Amino acid sequence: AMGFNKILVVCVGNICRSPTGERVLQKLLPNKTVASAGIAAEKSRLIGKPADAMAIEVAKENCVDVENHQSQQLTSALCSQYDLILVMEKGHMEALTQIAPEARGKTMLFGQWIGQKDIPDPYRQSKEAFVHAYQLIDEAAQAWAKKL
Ligand SMILES: [Cl-]
């Protein structure tokens, strides 16, 4: 009914949380187009980095494919192509507003339907941190799927 067909999942690096969230939500909603971007996307010179090796490993154990990901920079042009934008932290909303002020009105929280929780960043931590990040992303995505 809302027409949220193209969904953009956003974090800072676009290598841990947002590619995980993108692929978990994509598996739950096969007829939707789910992509991801970073407020300060991690790049190798100018090439988009793949998802963190541990993020790929943890998702693989939960039957979610996070291979063939290339990080991309969040821009106003990119935001204009999506119907719904889902940030990983409430704090990300201020930075997103500076890049894409026209995206105000379609920027929502990834963990909105799980008590408005921020998804913990597992970057540079052990496998267990990647497990907890995945588990909370899964709970949040399942709650979004019932509303989409
Ligand atoms: Cl991040």
Author numbering: -1 to 146
The authors write:
VvWzb crystallized in the space group P212121, with two protein molecules in one asymmetric unit. The two molecules formed a dimer in the crystal, with an interface area of about 900 Å2. However, this seems to be a crystallographic dimer, since VvWzb existed as a monomer in solution, indicated by gel filtration. VvWzb adopts a typical LMWPTP α/β fold. Like other LMWPTPs, the active site crevice of free VvWzb is composed of the P-loop (residues Cys9−Ser16), D-loop (residues Lys115−Gln123), and W-loop (residues Ile37−Lys47). The W-loop of VvWzb, which is longer than any known LMWPTP by harboring a four-residue insert (40EKSR43), bulges out, with residues Ser42, Arg43, and Leu44 located at the tip region and residue Glu40 pointing toward the active site. Compared with the D-loop wall, which is relatively orthogonal to the P-loop bottom, the W-loop wall seems to be laid flat. In such a configuration, the active site crevice of free VvWzb is wide and shallow, being readily accessible for the substrate. Due to the presence of Glu40, the W-loop wall region of the crevice is negatively charged. In the absence of ligand, the supposed phosphate-binding site is occupied by a chloride ion and a few water molecules; they interact with the P- and D-loop residues via extensive hydrogen bonding.
Protein tyrosine phosphorylation regulates the production of capsular polysaccharide, an essential virulence factor of the deadly pathogen Vibrio vulnificus. The process requires the protein tyrosine kinase Wzc and its cognate phosphatase Wzb, both of which are largely uncharacterized. VvWzb belongs to the low-molecular-weight protein tyrosine phosphatase (LMWPTP) family. Interestingly, it contains an extra four-residue insertion in the W-loop, distinct from all known LMWPTPs.
